[PDB]
Symmetry: D5
Subunit: 156 residues, 10 copies
Amino acid sequence: MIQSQINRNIRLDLADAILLSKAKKDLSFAEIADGTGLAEAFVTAALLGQQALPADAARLVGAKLDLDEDSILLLQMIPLRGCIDDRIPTDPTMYRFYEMLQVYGTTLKALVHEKFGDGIISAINFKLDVKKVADPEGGERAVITLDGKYLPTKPF
Amino acid sequence: MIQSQINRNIRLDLADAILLSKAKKDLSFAEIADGTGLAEAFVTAALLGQQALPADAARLVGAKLDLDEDSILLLQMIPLRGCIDDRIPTDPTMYRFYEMLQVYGTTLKALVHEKFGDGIISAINFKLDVKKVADPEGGERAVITLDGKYLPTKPF
Amino acid sequence: MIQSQINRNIRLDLADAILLSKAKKDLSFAEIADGTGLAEAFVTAALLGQQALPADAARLVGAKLDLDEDSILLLQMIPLRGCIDDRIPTDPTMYRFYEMLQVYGTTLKALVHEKFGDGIISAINFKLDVKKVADPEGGERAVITLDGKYLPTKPF
Amino acid sequence: MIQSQINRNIRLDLADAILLSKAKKDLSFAEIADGTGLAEAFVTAALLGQQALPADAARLVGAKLDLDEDSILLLQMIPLRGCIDDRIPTDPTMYRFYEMLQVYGTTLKALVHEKFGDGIISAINFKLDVKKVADPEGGERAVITLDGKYLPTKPF
Amino acid sequence: MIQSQINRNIRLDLADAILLSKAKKDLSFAEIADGTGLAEAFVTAALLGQQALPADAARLVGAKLDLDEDSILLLQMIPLRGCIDDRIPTDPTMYRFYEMLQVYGTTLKALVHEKFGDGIISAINFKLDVKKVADPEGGERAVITLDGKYLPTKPF
Amino acid sequence: MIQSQINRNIRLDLADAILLSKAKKDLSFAEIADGTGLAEAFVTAALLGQQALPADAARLVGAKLDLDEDSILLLQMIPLRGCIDDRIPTDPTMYRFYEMLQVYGTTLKALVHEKFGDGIISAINFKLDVKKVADPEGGERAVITLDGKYLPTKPF
Amino acid sequence: MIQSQINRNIRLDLADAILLSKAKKDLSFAEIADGTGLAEAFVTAALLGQQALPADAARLVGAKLDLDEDSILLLQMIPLRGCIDDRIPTDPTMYRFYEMLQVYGTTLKALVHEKFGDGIISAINFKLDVKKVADPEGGERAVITLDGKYLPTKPF
Amino acid sequence: MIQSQINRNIRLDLADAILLSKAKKDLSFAEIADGTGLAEAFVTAALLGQQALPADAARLVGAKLDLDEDSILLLQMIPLRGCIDDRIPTDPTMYRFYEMLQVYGTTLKALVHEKFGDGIISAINFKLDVKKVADPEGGERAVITLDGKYLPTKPF
Amino acid sequence: MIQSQINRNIRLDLADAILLSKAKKDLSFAEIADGTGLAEAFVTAALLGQQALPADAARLVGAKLDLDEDSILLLQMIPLRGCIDDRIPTDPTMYRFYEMLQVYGTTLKALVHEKFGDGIISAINFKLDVKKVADPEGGERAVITLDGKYLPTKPF
Amino acid sequence: MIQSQINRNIRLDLADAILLSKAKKDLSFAEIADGTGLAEAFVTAALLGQQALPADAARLVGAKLDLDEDSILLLQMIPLRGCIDDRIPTDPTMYRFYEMLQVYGTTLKALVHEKFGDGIISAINFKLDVKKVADPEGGERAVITLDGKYLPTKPF
Ligand SMILES: [Cl-]
Ligand SMILES: [Cl-]
Ligand SMILES: [Cl-]
Ligand SMILES: [Cl-]
Ligand SMILES: [Cl-]
Ligand SMILES: [Cl-]
Ligand SMILES: [Cl-]
Ligand SMILES: [Cl-]
Ligand SMILES: [Cl-]
Ligand SMILES: [Cl-]
């Protein structure tokens, strides 16, 4: 039977415990996800409180991080999502994604409406991934791909 | 000489006027950007007050929308950026991008640090684009690509 | 070509003018929507700045309300949605719906997860209606039906 | 003698303990409410800190979840209601109900005044329920019924 | 047909015009409400944007204040209520009533639940009045009576 | 010597302990205040952290609730007042008193200035009480009396 | 008959026009108050929207500043007080008195309770003045004296 | 070597421990500060987390209150100042000082600029004291003296 | 006689008018400040509403921007300072200086107390400047120098 | 493998423990950074939770502060940055840097665009230092140098 949380602090506290175990073992997110059959972004988001693992994955990652049974159970609960402490991020890495919305949010709305129509690009029928690509001018770039279904607003 | 603004309401009120003129002419953002040499996302963001157009582009779009000389001049001023009325969007279309940040912000941080290092993905050396494609299960998806330079945080 | 707005106050000022015209004519929202083919909640929401009308419906309601051509065109533009002035309503009628969320929001989350699974009930593939019924104990009751598609959250 | 609470954290802490017991026992909210004579939405809201259980229901659910005597007494206290952590939900499932108010809140106002008159639809002489319905286009929909008494505002 | 507003600034702008007319004419609220059949607190609240007047009272107050026909019409519309500019009052007179809630709000909750039960004292089925009483230690006291219907919360 | 607090959470923690003791003993606030010579609204407010009890009343209530000597001392300290968690109540019972201010707060200002003059009705030279009265139409009403000294604002 | 305001912006806009006129005439607050019989702090506060002037003073300062009849009338209304734009001042000169409260607020509470007892120092039966004194180490000091009645909180 | 703090909660927790000790010993702030050669407002503010005591004063108060060595050391640390829990006080005693700013803040600004010039009255080169004196009309008044250095703002 | 403002919108509206004049004339801030005898950062801040100009500088810049006589007088008024629209900047250029304080604010505090002692680095006995320096790894850097007097906090 | 945090409180609690260790040892920040090869501002920021230390510097500062292994490991984790408790500082020393932004933030924007172009000065390719110098008028000054790379915003 599905089980769900109503207070994010329980899963976020567990995420802090998971990160200390991870660092003591000198593990990467890529190696924790490897073998689960699940994408690294999904498994990472679950460890950080924002997705629920299926039971087999929760046991797999639980063994790798030496978690106890209550923590393996908690990773399978549907979370009360929301990773930002107080609405706007303070951390510079996270903030730049907020700034992208402050600069391009109205452009994203306008172009979605022109290409698709009235309605939204979903954050639920949705996936994202992060890739590193060489910059031809030197250094490295991240290409982050947001891929969401269009859901139309029609008249009723 | 470069010229800059300190109150966003001047360019946002210009954007409202632009959009009325666009609608009376039954124009698209794609056709407005046609012939400028510049990407639709960048041009549209300038119309909506979030970027500056080079003089030639400003004249080109200004002839298409029948703008007066002060409006063409304002399009070339560096803006006081920030398109969200009050920190969190109310509009559903814009809000889903904010929800992507509430659900995957910490994951984006974690995977950026693992793949690149300490530091940021820039929102300045940065480009974005929106493509429409079919969904293999039916309907349509948006693939939005955020492409920013990695800038490292190093000890000093 | 679809056209969209980025500042809610244009459509909200139109809504105030619509209301004054409506009052001078002693019109009801039911009679305004009559003839359009569209549900009274959807037409009323467009008048109040939260939906877009198709052209024929815009022209029809525009004739009933004596609207000018710029107003008719504005009702066809996709709005920057968000009807609450500052996040939490002050008006008692609207505030009771917010209070329903404060009392039952976590119960709605828990029972949506038990009945459907992880994911959301959509606010976009969605219809609402308000029906007046008799209260068998005396008086009248509103039965407000929120009818949204279940969109699952699945691992990837 | 009726007893009441003044700080929500006592019952919300109890709610987190209840959810952990429920998960360990792999119980559903439907099974917890069975035998009580009360609707699942009501009993679930009480477990989550937003309603008071009558003594016999408190003892029933208490035995199912192996709660101690103080927890069984706290479920009978009238709560300090308010389930949303900080005014606007961050959780997607909960946020969509908030977005329904941002899009349709003024329309609910307008139609309540047209159909009933000045006043409110109560959140106190009130009930809700959640039903699952097949969608004809594929998938499932939730039909969430809000059913409140009209209470008039009259001159004095 | 009943008519309702969705932005409070229309009626609050009206209230400022009413106050200027009232001051130029050197009228009291008591004299304005005289002849309407309605309590001074209700008529005053309507002038200040927070209640609707029946048409005969709107016409009577409109004559006294030399209002125009659109303003007499606006006074009959059901308002978007909420008189405090930004949630907590700044004005000392208004603030003391907010302070009474900061000091005694939990006591009011507790004594309402003990004397009546679970539920609320209504702000809709509700009257208030302000009376001036001599203080036996010297000076004057205000006795403000809040008189609301008890509406119970019961299981379903 | 008089002693005063600066962190509300000490007294609010004590309040929660008091309410648990009170519920275990099945006591009423009227019976706790019986024998103190003090009004039930004042005594209840002290229990809930918003007033100080004189030492004899603190020992009297402490006997009835079986409080330890540290708790009886704490009830005599002058509190850091403010019972609302975060400015606006979430609880429906408390909220309706806030809604009375949002509806009538400008009316109370205007009528206090008309009846008394510039200045305020005190919240310190002040008493409140709650009475239950039958409603002639059926049911029960609360009559809450707010009785405050008028303090004038004069030029100097 | 006393007249009062509900929107501070009318008197704050008046204040801006008063200050322009004062600057064009190169007047000081001291000379505007000289001759009224009223303290400079009280007259200045009225000009700035935070007190009401008696009619003779309003005519005197209105002649000095060349105000029109509507402005002289507005100066006599009881204001909706609160001079800070958005709760915390941005201006450095004002902010330092807020910082006094952040550093010493609990000390003021503690010393008021020690010296006087439970209750408050009034902001209504209250005067302030500002004096310039030489600093013996060099330069100048402002001695600002806040002089308020103690009003006791007593049990009832 | 001077030592500083970055989290106010350490010293505010000390303050709560100090006030419990003080109350158990039935001590006054006047007596705590006696012998220290420092003003009672300065010593009190250090106890409550808002100033640092020189080492001899720390030792001497620590003796009176029986503090442990981590607490006598902590009193000498430079605090992270800010005594108001959440920007605006809820306690009535503290709030009246905030209300003095809401009423007279712009008057204080205007009179400081006229009497001294552009710049500030310092909150750092600053002393405050509270005196109790009789009111000539009966009762008692607080005379609170804010004495700060003028620091000019001049061009560069 | 010195003159001061109390609402920032008068000077910020002026700044917008100055900026439009500047752009029409294609002037730089360096050239506007030329001839004034004042630093470019000071003069620019005055044009943007955050400092006052002496009369000869105001007349000089006024002639270069073709300002009217009331504008030239406004530039001499002491401003109600505070350039950030709503506490945290949205503009990326401005936000990076805020992010410096989120990352280094507690380090600034720590190192100021270490090197100087308890007290502050002034923002009034203060100057800043911006210099462009080549980066040896390519490109350019800004060296922004904040230079403030240390003002100690001493016991009294 | 690089490791990162997502909740600032883990490193901020570590900072508080580091500060108590430092105070017991009578250590300076300059002494703690000595021998690390890293600037005191960077090492002090790491101790306070806002930067990561390389492993050899972590071990070195850990030896000086008697830190346990988990604490040395936590200092090497990439932090969730953000040192201000709630957006605007309360502490006077911190606040003056914020005030520098409220007074000069728009001037910094204007001058960066004039000297460099559209774009930002980086807070990531960035160094800061604090230097104490004599004030030639008497006393001491801090010279705080902010040195960041200019990153241009160009059309795409
Ligand atoms: Cl979605
Ligand atoms: Cl960036
Ligand atoms: Cl949705
Ligand atoms: Cl209700
Ligand atoms: Cl109600
Ligand atoms: Cl009072
Ligand atoms: Cl008062
Ligand atoms: Cl200062
Ligand atoms: Cl300063
Ligand atoms: Cl940056």
